[PDB]
Structure formats: structure tokens, C-alpha cells
Amino acid sequence: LSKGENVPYTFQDEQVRSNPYIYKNHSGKLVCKLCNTMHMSWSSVERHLGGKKHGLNVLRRGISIEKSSGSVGLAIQVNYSSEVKENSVDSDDKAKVPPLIRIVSGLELSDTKQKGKKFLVIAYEPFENIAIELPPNEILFSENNDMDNNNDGVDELNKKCTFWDAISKLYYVQ
Amino acid sequence: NTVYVGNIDPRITKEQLYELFIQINPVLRIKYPKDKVLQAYQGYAFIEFYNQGDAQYAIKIMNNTVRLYDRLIKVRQVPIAKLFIKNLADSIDSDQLVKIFNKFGKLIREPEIFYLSKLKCAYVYFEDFEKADLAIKSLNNQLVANNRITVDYAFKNGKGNAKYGDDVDRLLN
Amino acid sequence: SRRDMEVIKLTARYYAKDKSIVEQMISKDGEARLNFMNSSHPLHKTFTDFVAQYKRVYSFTGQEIKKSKRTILDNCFERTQYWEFEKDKDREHDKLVELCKIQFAAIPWDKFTQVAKFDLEQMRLRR
Amino acid sequence: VERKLAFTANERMAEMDILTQKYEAPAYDSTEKEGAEQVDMPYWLYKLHGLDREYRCEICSNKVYNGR
Amino acid sequence: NLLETRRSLLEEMEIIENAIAERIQRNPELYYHYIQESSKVFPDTKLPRSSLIAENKIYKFKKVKRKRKQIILQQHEINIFLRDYQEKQQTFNKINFERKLQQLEKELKNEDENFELDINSKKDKYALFS
Ligand SMILES: [Zn+2]
Ligand SMILES: [Zn+2]
């Protein structure tokens, strides 16, 4: 009935769940943490999920989440796969989207130890992100390079100074 | 007796807060709100000391002093007469309103000019119901800037009840 | 603006035949009148237009245009078609851009893994 | 011809009205489209919880409160 | 200078073509209608895909259907436009040093005090046909 899935106890301090709600409390019985309902058997649970009140609680949680949350310059040459693994994924899912760059402040890190400098992060869907430290307060930060044409793409940075050789898979940034 | 605290790492625990702020002063209680949805704190707290002096001293000493996980902690501290007036002249500035109504009563706030229907109207805030009684007595249905103006009480049906006179009298006293 | 127009169009008339008479005039006279000759002066651009146009009139001099009604119509239809096509390209572009904005807004800029620390316009073409 | 011929009086009259209107009508209406191209509540809740029940407090502006 | 005249001519012709092309754009029927009839008079004439005709589209966008009176109107307007065009094309067919440069540039100094904004050559034409 359970489809062989292990439903962890409430106290086990979280393998991804199917429905991330139904638990077993400190006692034996089954619980739905949204609706705060106690169910005796897994069939009653499947009737709860197929019930109307659980849907209402899921939507109310949806709204509850959606309301809150002449100089010197640098040039980088990033190379990508040679049709080695990209042969299994070609379903026009952002495949047309080129790599993207953003300047991030080190004030926020997974470890939060030291900080105080910027990073020129570069990202592509499958591959892993990449960063480059920029101690200099400003370099190559130009002044109206082109003649003010407005296709924002992502931002002034990307259109202003990036090139994506998609035929060879080479991303240049300067 | 309670002080606000902000810019808190969600990784901070009530234990760590208590250990921090007991250095400054005895802390009666710490209300450090958690989101019970995510079991994740919101990054702010309320620290209630025993008296006011400890609260003020803690505000002075601990504001922008300490960095918890590089994050610099923040420590901070934490009914009147109204008249509707209709058919005003477009030549009447709010300051001219002030000069008009000051002789009648002292304004707790500034008047509010708004257009109904085209129709220039305003709300005038007096500190006294009796001074407003003077303003209505003299100014009601009176020609200013070559325009007849009407002065009455603003609706809430309007102000000027008996309980209104009593409790406004008390708030003044 | 009749003056400016007239001088632009005149220097454009001569500039269309020789290109040597103006380059001599500039050195002979020395007047801030022809300041539009440098690509710096905005009007210069429109100049590049006029000349081209005159250059065009020199194209079929000695040749008559014998377009018929039918043909003119067909042509205007094809032009319409073109405009529609261009419009479609613009649309598609807007779409792709939208996608990009979505993904950029939707990726973890905190998944850092750095290594080290520290003309494209003619390059964004093909040859 | 055959249609009009097979009409009644009222019918033929209304039809004529239509032809007339079509004749004396602006070629462009003030109500035409430009650039419309296609391609190709908890009711019982407040009574339970006690809300939406009018109540009054004298001390604050004789204010009204919708729930206890 | 004939160059200027012939220029203005080619430019006006361009303007007209652009106008009747904009028209054919907003409501393809204008051409379609016409073309269909033409089909049965001059058999050779190539006509668009039926789908285009029906959906009233030229490429991707299907345009709003217009009423008869307007279609005909614009067709007569385009008619006079094509008349103008034919005339200009005609006159054009019938129409088609340094010391002189400075010579004319000197006379261009004439009437310096002519305070007036002049934005009415291509705008009055573009406008004259839109
Ligand atoms: Zn549930
Ligand atoms: Zn109260």
C-alpha cells in the first residue's frame, strides 16, 4: 500500500520524500503535518491526500510562501564539452540560452568565514559555476561603449562585454 | 524594558543570544521568533531586561559593536479634532489654511487638501474641540478668496459627539 | 535649417562625383561651416545617406525604369512580407531574451568554485 | 433578387435599412482594432471563530470591532 | 541640378511604395482580393497559398478582417497612389568644378537671418501618404 516507501518519524531530523508531509509521530500513528490529521492506516492517508481539505491547506501554504522570500582590462576564455555528454539532452529546454555572468559580493558564502571582495561568476545549466576574484575596485568599467541600443538580454554587463561562440562552445568575457 | 535586535544569523540559537547579552546586563526574557512553518528564525529578536536603564545602556554599548558570523548586530529601542471643509478656493494654499486656522486653534498636524466630485475640500486637525468650535462658529459659511466655504466636522456619523467631547477633553488634559 | 540642409546636400552632390573637391575645399577655406564632414558631427550620418542616394542616381543614368502596375503591386506585397518576417525575428528575439532573464534570475549565485584571480564587436561576426 | 423577392414587408424593409446603413457609414469606425494580430469568502469560518460580529467599545472613539 | 530632382523623385516613389506596402500589410485582403480577380483575367499570374488568403495573413500573423467599404476605399486610394507613381516614373525617365563649389557655397550665405525650423520635406511627404 505504501509503495514500499519508508516514512520517517517526526523526530529523526531529516533520499527525497514522495509527499513531504505524512510522517509517523513519536507514537505509531500516521500524521499529516499541514492538516494536523492523525491517520490509522496508509489507505486513510491516501484518502487524505485525495481529500479536499489537504488541497486547501496545500494552496494556503502556496500563498503563504508566495508572499515572502585607454586602460587595462581582463579577458576570460571558457571552454565547454566536445559533444561528449550533450548528446543525450536536446529538447530545446533553454538550450538556446547562452552562459551567464554576474558580479557577486563575498559577503554571502556557504561557510561565511572571510569576505570583502567580488567574484565574476559564470554559469551554464549542466556545468558547475565558476568564479574569479576582483580585488581592483574597477577595471575595464567602460563609458557608453556602443550607441545606446536597448536589448537588455540579462543586463548591461552581459550584452556590453560577452561573446558566446556557440558553434565551438567558447565563452569569452571582457 | 524590551529592546529590538536585528541582523541576526538564522544559525544563531537562543542560547548564544543569552550568553551574549548577559555580559551586558541581566536579561529577564528573550523572545526570539521562529517561523513554525520552516523551523527557521527570521533574523531578529526582542530582548526584555528587568528595568529601563539596563535596556538603554545595552542599546548604547551593543549597537554595531559585535559581528556574529561577520554580520554586525543591530540593537534599537521600541484622537484629535478634525474638520471637513467644502467649497474652498483654488487660490488657498495649505499654508494659508494654517494661517487661517491658527488663530482659532493650534494645529496638531497640517490640513489635507483633496478634490471631490473638482470640489476643493480639506481636513483640518485641531488640538482642541472648543477651539474647533470657535473655528466653526466664525468660519462656517464664510466668504474667503471670493468663495463661500463651509466648515463642519469630518465623518468617521461625524465627530463632535458627547463621548467625543469627553475623551478629547481628557486627551487634552 | 534650410542653410544646413543646402550645404549638406551640395557638398554631398560634389562629394558624390569626386570626393576630392571637398578634401581640397576643407584645406583651402578653413571654415567651421563644413564641420559635418567629420563623423563626430551627428549630421554627418545623414550626409552619408544623401551622398549614397546621389551615388545611386549615378547608377542607372542612361537607363529608364519601365515597371508596370502589376509589378509595382507585387513588389509592395513582397515588401510587406519582408516587414512581417522582420517583425517575427524581433518577436523571437524578445522571447529568447525572456528565457535568459528567467534562468539568470533562477540560478544559485552562491554555488562558488573559483580558481584564480586578476574589440569584441568586430569579433562577434564571421570571417 | 430571389431573396428580397421571397421576403415579407417587414423583412424587405429591414433589409433595405441594412443596405442603407452600409451605404452611409464611415469606412473606419471609432471602435476598430489596431495591432490585434494572431499567430500562425470563508463564510462559516468567521462564525466559528466569532469574527464579522459587530461589537462596540466606548472608550476608543466608540469604535466598532468585528470579532471578539 | 538635375541630380537633386531625380533624387527627390526616386525618394517619393520609395515613399509611395512604402505606403501602399504598409496598407497591404495591415489588411492583406487588399492585395489578395485584387490578385484573385487578376488570376482569372491573366491566367499566368501566380497567387498565394489558399491558407494565407483565408486566415488573412501574409506570413505568421493573421490580421483582422475588414468590411467591404474600407477594402474598396483603400483600393481606390492605392489606385491614385499608383497613378502618382506612374507620373513621377515618367517625368524621371524624361529627365534622366571646385570654383563652382565655392561659387555656390558663397551664395548660400544669402539671407543669414532666416530664423525658422525646417522639418517638412520627408515628414510632409511621409505624412502626405500615410
Ligand atoms: Zn494534509
Ligand atoms: Zn478600547
Neighboring chains of A (3 or more beta-carbon pairs < 8 A)? B, C
Q: Taking a C-beta distance cutoff of 8 angstroms, is the pair D61, B157 a contact?
A: no
Examine the domain organization and report whether C19 and C77 are in the same domain.
no
Ligand 2 centroid, distance to D56 Cα (angstroms): 9
What residues form DSSP beta bridges with A165?
A: A170
Ligand 1 centroid, distance to A37 Cα (angstroms): 7
Chains A and E touch (3+ CB pairs under 8 A): no
Which position has the grid cell 574589440?
A: C119
Name the DSSP letter for residue A24.
Answer: E
Residues 6+ apart with CB under 8 A from D62: B161, B163, D56
What distance in Å separates residue B164's CA from the closest CA in chain D?
A: 7
Backbone angles phi, psi at B63, to 5 degrees: -80, 120
DSSP line for E64-103: PPPPHHHHHHHHHHHHHHHHHHHHHHHHHHHH--HHHHHH
Name the DSSP letter for residue C69.
Answer: H
The span from the CA of A147 to the CA of A30, in Å, is: 65
The span from the CA of A16 to the CA of A13, in Å, is: 13
- Residue C69: count other Cβ atoms within 10 Å of its Cβ: 12
* Biggest distance spanned by C-alpha atoms of chain C: 70
Ligand nearest to the Cα of A52, by number: 1
Q: Taking a C-beta distance cutoff of 8 angstroms, is the pair E71, E27 a contact?
A: yes
Torsion angle (degrees, nearest 10) of CA C66, C67, C68, C70: 160
C62: phi > 0 → left, psi -120 to 50 → alpha, else beta; which? left
Q: On the CB side of B163, how many CA atoms lie within 13 Å of its CA?
A: 9
Interface contact B70-A64, CB threshold 8 A: no
Examine the domain organization and report whether C2 and C49 are in the same domain.
yes
Residues in C lying within 8 Å of A, measured between beta carbons: 93, 96-97, 99-101, 103-104, 107-118, 120-121, 123-124
Q: What is the CA radius of gyration of chain D?
A: 32
Burial (CB < 10 A; 0-12, 13-18, 19+), residue D60, is: exposed
In 3-state terms, what secondary structure has residue A136?
A: coil
- Cβ contacts (< 8 Å) between C81 and chain E: which residues? 58-59
What distance in Å separates residue D20's CA from the closest CA in chain E?
A: 13
What distance in Å separates residue E44's CA from the closest CA in chain C?
A: 12
Q: Taking a C-beta distance cutoff of 8 angstroms, is the pair B119, B142 a contact?
A: no
Interface contact C123-A102, CB threshold 8 A: no
Residue of E nearest to D21 (CA): E69
The cell for C31 is: 571654415
Please check whether residue A129 touches C, CB under 8 A: yes
Ligand nearest to the Cα of A34, by number: 1
In 3-state terms, what secondary structure has residue C24?
A: helix
The span from the CA of D4 to the CA of C85, in Å, is: 46
List, edge to edge, every strand of the sheet that includes A133-134.
A100-105, A118-123, A133-134
Examine the domain organization and report whether C45 and C103 are in the same domain.
no
Interface contact B156-D59, CB threshold 8 A: no
What residues form DSSP beta bridges with A127?
A: none
Backbone angles phi, psi at A82, to 5 degrees: -105, 75
Residues 6+ apart with CB under 8 A from D61: B79, B156, B164, B167
Interface contact E62-D28, CB threshold 8 A: no
The span from the CA of B122 to the CA of B149, in Å, is: 11
Domain around C14: 1-25+38-63
Domain count for chain C: 2
Residues 43 to 82 of B: which have CB under 8 A from any D CB?
79
Q: What are the structural domain ranges in chain B?
A: 1-78, 79-173
Examine the domain organization and report whether C52 and C97 are in the same domain.
no
Q: Inter-axis angle of helices B162-172 and B129-139, to 10 degrees?
A: 120
Q: Taking a C-beta distance cutoff of 8 angstroms, is the pair B111, B132 a contact?
A: no
Please check whether residue D41 touches E, CB under 8 A: no
CATH of the domain at C96: 6.10.250.1320
Interface contact B70-A115, CB threshold 8 A: yes
Examine the domain organization and report whether C49 and C78 are in the same domain.
no
Residues 78 to 107 of C: which have CB under 8 A from any E CB?
79-81, 83-85, 87-88
Please check whether residue A55 touches C, CB under 8 A: no
Examine the domain organization and report whether C56 and C18 are in the same domain.
yes
Examine the domain organization and report whether C17 and C59 are in the same domain.
yes
The span from the CA of E62 to the CA of B51, in Å, is: 76
- Cβ contacts (< 8 Å) between E108 and chain C: which residues? 3, 6-7, 10
Ligand nearest to the Cα of A56, by number: 1
Interface contact C109-A130, CB threshold 8 A: no
B90: phi > 0 → left, psi -120 to 50 → alpha, else beta; which? alpha
Query: CA nearest E80: which of D32, C69, A117?
Result: C69
Q: What's the reported resolution, in angstroms, to a tenth?
A: 3.4
In 3-state terms, what secondary structure has residue B137?
A: helix
* Biggest distance spanned by C-alpha atoms of chain E: 64
Residue of B nearest to A21 (CA): B37
Examine the domain organization and report whether C45 and C86 are in the same domain.
no
Residue of E nearest to D33 (CA): E64
The span from the CA of C41 to the CA of C52, in Å, is: 18
Number of H helices, E strands in chain D: 3, 2
Query: CA nearest A108: which of D25, D50, D39, B71?
Result: B71
DSSP line for E42-59: STT-----HHHHHHTBSS
Beta-sheet strands, E only, within A91-157: 100-105, 118-123, 133-134
Ligand 1 centroid, distance to A68 Cα (angstroms): 22
Q: Taking a C-beta distance cutoff of 8 angstroms, is the pair C63, A119 a contact?
A: no
Residue of E nearest to C50 (CA): E7
Examine the domain organization and report whether C70 and C58 are in the same domain.
no
Beta-sheet strands, E only, within B14-164: 27-31, 34-35, 40-41, 45-49, 67-68, 71-72, 74-77, 81-86, 112-116, 119-126, 142-144, 147-153
The verdict on residue C32 lying in a domain is: no
Interface contact A119-C112, CB threshold 8 A: yes
**Residues in chain E, total:** 130
Examine the domain organization and report whether C58 and C2 are in the same domain.
yes
Which position has the grid cell 469606412?
A: D27
Query: CA nearest B81: which of B45, B120, B132?
Result: B132
Ligand 2 centroid, distance to D67 Cα (angstroms): 13
Examine the domain organization and report whether C3 and C59 are in the same domain.
yes
The verdict on residue C97 lying in a domain is: yes
The verdict on residue C125 lying in a domain is: no
Examine the domain organization and report whether C79 and C103 are in the same domain.
yes
Q: Taking a C-beta distance cutoff of 8 angstroms, is the pair B21, B39 a contact?
A: no
Angle at E16 between CA E11 and CA E18, to 5 degrees: 90
Query: CA nearest A101: which of A159, A168, A36, A165?
Result: A159
Query: CA nearest A25: which of A42, A43, A41, A7?
Result: A7
The span from the CA of A31 to the CA of A37, in Å, is: 5
The span from the CA of D4 to the CA of B5, in Å, is: 88
In 3-state terms, what secondary structure has residue B151?
A: strand
The span from the CA of A100 to the CA of C101, in Å, is: 10
Burial E34-64 (b: 16+ CB within 10 A, else e): bbeebeeeeeeeeebeeeebebbbbbebbbe
CATH of the domain at C20: 1.10.10.790
In 3-state terms, what secondary structure has residue A112?
A: coil
- Residue A90: count other Cβ atoms within 10 Å of its Cβ: 8
Q: Which residues surround ligand 1, an ion (CB under 5 A)?
A: A 32, 34-35, 54
Burial (CB < 10 A; 0-12, 13-18, 19+), residue E29, is: buried
Burial (CB < 10 A; 0-12, 13-18, 19+), residue C50, is: buried
The cell for D25 is: 457609414
Burial (CB < 10 A; 0-12, 13-18, 19+), residue C31, is: exposed
Angle at B126 between CA B125 and CA B129, to 5 degrees: 125
The verdict on residue C113 lying in a domain is: no
The cell for A56 is: 486547501
The span from the CA of A51 to the CA of B39, in Å, is: 26
- Residue A66: count other Cβ atoms within 10 Å of its Cβ: 8
Neighboring chains of B (3 or more beta-carbon pairs < 8 A)? A, D
